[PDB]
Amino acid sequence: HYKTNKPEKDGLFCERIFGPIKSGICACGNYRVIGDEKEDPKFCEQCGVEFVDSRIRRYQMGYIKLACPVTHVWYLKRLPSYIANLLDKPLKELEGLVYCDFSFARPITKKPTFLRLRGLFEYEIQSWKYSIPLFFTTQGFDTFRNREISTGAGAIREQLADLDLRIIIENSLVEWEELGEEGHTGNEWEDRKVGRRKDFLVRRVELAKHFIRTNIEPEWMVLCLLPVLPPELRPIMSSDINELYRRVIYRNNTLTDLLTTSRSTPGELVMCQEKLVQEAVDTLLD
């Protein structure tokens, strides 16, 4: 709080969501003793803060709901890209679709698709879409656009979700068996390209085989919700952790405001704010 030194409600240091700042004291102003013989309410009706020792602030976590999904920096932007390994699409295409406004034609392969674009990277939205949205009911257009061309962070999640690891390992084994017949006979450049492709295929096979039997889903590589560290661990004197947290919170609430304002809002503004949110998440993580 301003010139009060008190935790703000529904904030980074909020007492309600994390816990009380003092042992036995609460934000409502009435002290209580935990474990007393007399019946005592665990939490004040007036104030959400529970009556407990303030050690919880050390071990208690939080989470910010994100309107637009974000992609983990470790999986995407490392030189070995697990996302680019699973999705045979090149790394440059994914980095563009994440950071530079582009479009992916078919992000879902398990649902019916009327449009026959079937393209990897759509460098522009100049394709006729205004006549298509007016023709169909506008609500209907919204309903199918997800199976249609998607942008930013929905295509990656739909590709990771709608995917058959068995088909992936089958196709990779087939391509491995095909390659290597006479590649070594060629030049050093061609042999190097064949070798790199073969190594990429082997890594893809290994990743898919591990994903099959590890009770872990590749869907979780793109973060729908971001956890928040316990308050005590980032105590405000103020830390950068918390500065980046405030930045991503501000960008996310601005994005949510723009989304909830009206559907007729310009796509450029919400897309730029999505890029800003994803860059803030990247700076926070790594």
Partner: protein, 90 residues
């Protein structure tokens, strides 16, 4: 199905698999430098988290590795009795 190209296995394990399996296993000796060796261990928290922490952490997280604390630094990080000397139950 048993092994993939480019993998690293143990010499005794490779010989025992070659004796048992008719499937041709082509393996050649790679002398591994001290650093490389550490980065390739059974524990992702003791020897893998010494030079490239984030890389091995992301790899173990995506794989879902399970580490059995049979090493010293593993119990050191966990804050428990190290299975050395008086910590070895016999």
């Amino acid at each position: 199905n048993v092994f993939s190209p480019g993998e690293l296995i143990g010499l005794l394990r490779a010989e025992r698999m070659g004796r048992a399996l008719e499937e041709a296993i082509c393996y050649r000796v790679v002398l591994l430098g001290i650093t490389r060796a550490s980065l390739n261990t059974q524990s992702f928290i003791s020897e893998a988290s010494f030079q490239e922490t984030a890389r091995v952490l992301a790899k173990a997280a995506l794989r879902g590795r399970i580490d059995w604390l049979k090493g010293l630094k593993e119990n050191v990080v966990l804050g428990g009795v190290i299975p050395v000397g008086t910590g070895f139950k016999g």
